[PDB]
Amino acid sequence: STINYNNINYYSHAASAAQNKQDFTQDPSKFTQPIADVIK
Amino acid sequence: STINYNNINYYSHAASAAQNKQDFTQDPSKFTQPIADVIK
Amino acid sequence: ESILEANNREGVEGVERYVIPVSVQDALDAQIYALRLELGGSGPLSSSLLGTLAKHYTQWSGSVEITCMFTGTFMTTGKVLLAYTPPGGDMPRNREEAMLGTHVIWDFGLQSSITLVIPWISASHFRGVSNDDVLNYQYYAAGHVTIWYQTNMVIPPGFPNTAGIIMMIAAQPNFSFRIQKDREDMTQTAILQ
Amino acid sequence: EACGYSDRVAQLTLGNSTITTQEAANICVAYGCWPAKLSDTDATSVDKPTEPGVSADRFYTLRSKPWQADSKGWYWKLPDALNNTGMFGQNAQFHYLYRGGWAVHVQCNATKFHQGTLLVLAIPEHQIATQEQPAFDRTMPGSEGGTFQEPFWLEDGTSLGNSLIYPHQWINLRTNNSATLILPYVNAIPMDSAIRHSNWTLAIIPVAPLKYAAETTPLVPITVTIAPMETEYNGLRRAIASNQ
Amino acid sequence: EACGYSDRVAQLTLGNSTITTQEAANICVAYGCWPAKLSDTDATSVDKPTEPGVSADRFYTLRSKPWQADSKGWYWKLPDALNNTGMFGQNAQFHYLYRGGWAVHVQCNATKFHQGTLLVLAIPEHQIATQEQPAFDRTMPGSEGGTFQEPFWLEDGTSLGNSLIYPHQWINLRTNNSATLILPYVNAIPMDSAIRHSNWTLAIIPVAPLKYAAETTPLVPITVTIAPMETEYNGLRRAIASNQ
Amino acid sequence: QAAGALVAGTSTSTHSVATDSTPALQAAETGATSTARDESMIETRTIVPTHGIHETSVESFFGRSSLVGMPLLATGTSITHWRIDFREFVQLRAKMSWFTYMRFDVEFTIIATSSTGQNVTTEQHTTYQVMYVPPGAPVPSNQDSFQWQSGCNPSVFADTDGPPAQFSVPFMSSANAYSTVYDGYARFMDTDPDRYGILPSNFLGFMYFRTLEDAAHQVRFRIYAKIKHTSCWIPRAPRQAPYKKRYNLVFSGDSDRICSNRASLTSY
Amino acid sequence: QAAGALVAGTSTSTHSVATDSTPALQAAETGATSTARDESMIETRTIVPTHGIHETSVESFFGRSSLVGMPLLATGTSITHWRIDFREFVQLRAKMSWFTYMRFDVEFTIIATSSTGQNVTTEQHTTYQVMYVPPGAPVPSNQDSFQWQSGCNPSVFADTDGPPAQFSVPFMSSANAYSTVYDGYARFMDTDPDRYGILPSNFLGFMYFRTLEDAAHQVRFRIYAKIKHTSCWIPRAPRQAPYKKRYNLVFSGDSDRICSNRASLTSY
Numbered sequence A, B: 001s002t003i004n005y006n007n008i009n010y011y012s013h014a015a016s017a018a019q020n021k022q023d024f025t026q027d028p029s030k031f032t033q034p035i036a037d038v039i040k
Numbered sequence C: 001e002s003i004l005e006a007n008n009r010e011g012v013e014g015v016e017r018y019v020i021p022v023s024v025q026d027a028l029d030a031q032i033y034a035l036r037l038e039l040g041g042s043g044p045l046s047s048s049l050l051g052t053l054a055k056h057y058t059q060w061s062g063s064v065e066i067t068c069m070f071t072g073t074f075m076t077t078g079k080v081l082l083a084y085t086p087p088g089g090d091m092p093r094n095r096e097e098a099m100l101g102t103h104v105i106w107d108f109g110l111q112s113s114i115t116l117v118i119p120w121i122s123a124s125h126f127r128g129v130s131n132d133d134v135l136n137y138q139y140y141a142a143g144h145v146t147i148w149y150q151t152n153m154v155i156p157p158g159f160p161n162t163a164g165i166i167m168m169i170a171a172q173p174n175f176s177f178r179i180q181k182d183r184e185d186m187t188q189t190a191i192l193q
Numbered sequence D, E: 001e002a003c004g005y006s007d008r009v010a011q012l013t014l015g016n017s018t019i020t021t022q023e024a025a026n027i028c029v030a031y032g033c034w035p036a037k038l039s040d041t042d043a044t045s046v047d048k049p050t051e052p053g054v055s056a057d058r059f060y061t062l063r064s065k066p067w068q069a070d071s072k073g074w075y076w077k078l079p080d081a082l083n084n085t086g087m088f089g090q091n092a093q094f095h096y097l098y099r100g101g102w103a104v105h106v107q108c109n110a111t112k113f114h115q116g117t118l119l120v121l122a123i124p125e126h127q128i129a130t131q132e133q134p135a136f137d138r139t140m141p142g143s144e145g146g147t148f149q150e151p152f153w154l155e156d157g158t159s160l161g162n163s164l165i166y167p168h169q170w171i172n173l174r175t176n177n178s179a180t181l182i183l184p185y186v187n188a189i190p191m192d193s194a195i196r197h198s199n200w201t202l203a204i205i206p207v208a209p210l211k212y213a214a215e216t217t218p219l220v221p222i223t224v225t226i227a228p229m230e231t232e233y234n235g236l237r238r239a240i241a242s243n244q
Numbered sequence F, G: 001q002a003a004g005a006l007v008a009g010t011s012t013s014t015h016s017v018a019t020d021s022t023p024a025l026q027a028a029e030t031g032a033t034s035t036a037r038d039e040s041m042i043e044t045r046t047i048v049p050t051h052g053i054h055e056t057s058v059e060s061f062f063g064r065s066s067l068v069g070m071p072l073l074a075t076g077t078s079i080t081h082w083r084i085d086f087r088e089f090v091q092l093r094a095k096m097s098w099f100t101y102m103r104f105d106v107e108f109t110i111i112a113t114s115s116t117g118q119n120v121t122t123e124q125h126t127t128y129q130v131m132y133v134p135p136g137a138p139v140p141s142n143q144d145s146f147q148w149q150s151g152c153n154p155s156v157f158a159d160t161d162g163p164p165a166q167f168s169v170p171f172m173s174s175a176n177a178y179s180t181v182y183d184g185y186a187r188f189m190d191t192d193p194d195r196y197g198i199l200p201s202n203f204l205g206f207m208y209f210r211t212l213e214d215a216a217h218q219v220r221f222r223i224y225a226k227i228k229h230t231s232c233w234i235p236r237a238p239r240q241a242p243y244k245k246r247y248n249l250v251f252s253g254d255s256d257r258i259c260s261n262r263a264s265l266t267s268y
């Protein structure tokens, strides 16, 4: 539960590389709490 | 009589790797001496 | 949160399918709604945001949240009981049986809505989203959610005797999906042009 | 210097049950005591007790009663009313002794077009009596509860007017939607049999009758939700459900 | 370098029950694991669990069975056999999930004039099968237990001889009066339904038949006493007693 | 690059008896989603986060090949082509329906198969040429045509019976991201329905195919596309009605319902 | 990673004449295995440990490919499938019978072979597609079916006459380990014998096969599975009776014996 892959691209262009294995943390608040005066 | 292998996995996922060549030492006592008051 | 197509009674056509009806009762301890907790095909849950997202995955885990908003006039009052019944048997027959499970008592007032949290109560860690009869996936049954009148919807003289509840549903922070699969409702009989 | 604002909204959560209310009248804690478990010095029964926790320490809702024009009042004996419901009932049956407190939430909603006033009382040792000594069906009516025949005398030869000396709240429709009482255990001994002795009696009596801005009026019910608190049981054996 | 002296006497006390024995063969703790509660890291069900303690964590004795000359063997599924007895049964019914260990004490006394040998086994996930797939009355026989039809194959197509790989003790009359096994919870998931899955099967099989110094022989029974250990329950609702 | 982000956990809770703090009570009118957490609604135990969220990441969701084109080369002409869209097949199209804007690279894999007139597999070995024909370049008219010299247009040559052909493509739009949807017209001073919802910036051209020698048997090209290095913006209500046409969103909509119907709302 | 663990050795012993220490005497009633070692029973010499134990390790025991499926694709339909179990063939099934719970990864290798009606080998070159169809995904009905787009379902394409196809799979169960055996029912409020001993958590779905063009000749798929990264718990008495059915443990059990019989116990 934390799959760390090998970058390594044998080609010149970035497009040639495989899929990004990195996990960016999500921020649902743009969609869940789009209110101005945030209350909890 | 001590076969030491090369880890090396060319893939991203752990499942992709070959079989574990490591030998864990066995402990038969869970099955051979499951008695509480151990006598010898 | 997305709105549940909860009023799926035979004969109800769109938009009205989004509003569960509540009305002044002449009977005590009456029932308002029943829903089998499934992220798997056909049911009201399946057409929602969470539900069509589940059409793409094969396993799930986590807590779900249901927020209901009352649509009656400002003068109309009421108290309802929302209950989640863990699996093992069938849907609660009466309110006395339903209240024995996980529940919330909602009081209509200035706060239009209430939230019923359906906690992750499973033996597994993960459940399958399908109810596939061939593989016996009803093994992964998750229970039932029922709604009852706690008091009654009472109105002033001449007011509308029927109002509604709009149910919304969303996944909670401990929710995750596993194994991508294809949607069964997105078909093609020929190449598009 | 002020008496109503944020005290109107409330949420109580016990076990897997939560209650909310948007028109409360604060919370009444009987005699200022919060339910508590039996002390090592006050105790007497030597066996290690059973403390069920969440399985029993939660809210149970009884069948609703309709508030009618000729309604005199209703009452429920505790633990009697709950002795046969859920995990609380099971523990009360299987043990010879029981001790516990209560969280009571009486609810009755109407409209700003109604008027009526209910007195909600928690009476300790409410030994009843009318022109004759009561029968089992009156003294221990179970979950269905009983009804006052002589509410003016409080079914005990005393008085409804002086009953305010007992823990209470009022459900006055122009003001509130419900009442909430927290009751500690009361008895002259450490523990007692749940099937032979009723410690508290929950009483609901209409003092100002229900009137409306029309002659009809929709069904206006009264619902009682109760939660056992800080319970402990001793003297485990087979289950025995009533004193009959 | 020695194998029998003070290991012959034993006393086990759980809750309000204590068992004694003057001819034991030590105590067997399955896989060397003592029953234990579910870890915060291993857990998955979010609700706070019910931990009954003394009310359920105690010894229950089932109806005795007579050891006859044609007796093939007996078995009980756990928690099945206890799902409807006492406070343990109540908790198992009222909850969707259960987890727990066991303390098993099988007893069979005879005389120094008898000879016979019983194999007492605790089989994990004992999925049975004969010439045909078993019916509910065979897979979940309740407190009365079941009987082996094909004991040589251990009712599963394996073998009685290789069954010693499972936690076990022998009740060899010339040596002992009884057997005691302590079993930890075993499953491939954290918790499970008590009414749909049997984790352990207690099996008692005569390997050397009962013989006596006469042809008659008094009634020689076999009694099973079992105690739930380190139990916890989740998913509270109404009581549901069987998977039917 | 590591994919170890976890789902949230659960911490222990106790009984609440508060005349102020009421998380169960919401107000959905604000457009905000409920604020209530498990812990504030029931007495909860502690659960340590053990579940991962990588399979729902935008990259993992789109990062697998899907059929997007399937041109058929006839024996008489020995040449076909394919307009580059992802609108011909429903599965991928519906996956993209979740977002308004998407920026990504593509990995194409092409599998060639020969068949008979009765569409049964046959053995056939030739070399085929796939040529990228961008807007403005002259189109080939025959298997013979001079346009196949490929002086500037890029081309890929592979065997009919050899491993699949494969290559990557950068993010090509003149725009800053592709649009799955467009509420506007393709041209100025034009208001034709056929030009509404058509965003030319998404059309990079055609892929032309031919065999290096006149074809003996049919030959069908299956074109697979893998979206990778994905960036998505503005989530949408996904597509529920079936797709009828390739260049617009019209649907049949006979019965106005999506989920199944039942006799009563009070019974299953 | 090194596999150098050794078997135990033998040290020298001498004569014993003790009225207290008696290791030869046991008491099997305790459920404990004998405590006696070679040295305490006979005068022994010294032997230095020279033998390894790696070939009996759980990993080495299961770590080799075995036949687990063998679907046959007919020429009329040009499509078959395989329910993913390891219960169809006896050799692997019996190896797993030694344990109650097993957690592991799998390596599948698929070999395709074409034949004639009389089952003789023929030459046939096409590309086949293997698609993973998880529970809930729509199943393909024809070689033509739209489900083969594989928008979300993963697929593997390889040649009939090319090297074997091969890939790995993680530990997929919803459970924490697979169960080789299950003393319970598949559903609630159901007590049917067909649902006893069936643990749905072990069934991850089907593998569907098709040729990319209607098949000219038969085509049989041999699916091999290699269990790797193995963890085993709770050893069992292994299976002695033959397997009759795929989903239960019924056996024939005519003669109640396993080993061979002899005339006398006192002679061979």
Ligand SMILES: CCCCCCCCCCCCCC(=O)O
Binding pocket: F084, F085, F086, F087, F106, F131, F132, F169, F172, F178, F179, F180, F202, F204, F207
């Ligand atoms: C061999 C020449 C390759 C050029 C390929 C450009 C591919 C871009 C695909 C963009 C799809 C836009 C979405 C849509 O179809 O509406």
Ligand SMILES: CCCCCCCCCCCCCC(=O)O
Binding pocket: G084, G085, G086, G087, G106, G131, G132, G169, G172, G178, G179, G180, G202, G204, G207
């Ligand atoms: C191409 C999709 C691959 C998915 C494969 C999952 C394989 C898991 C095998 C588990 C076998 C369980 C044991 C049994 O057969 O009873």
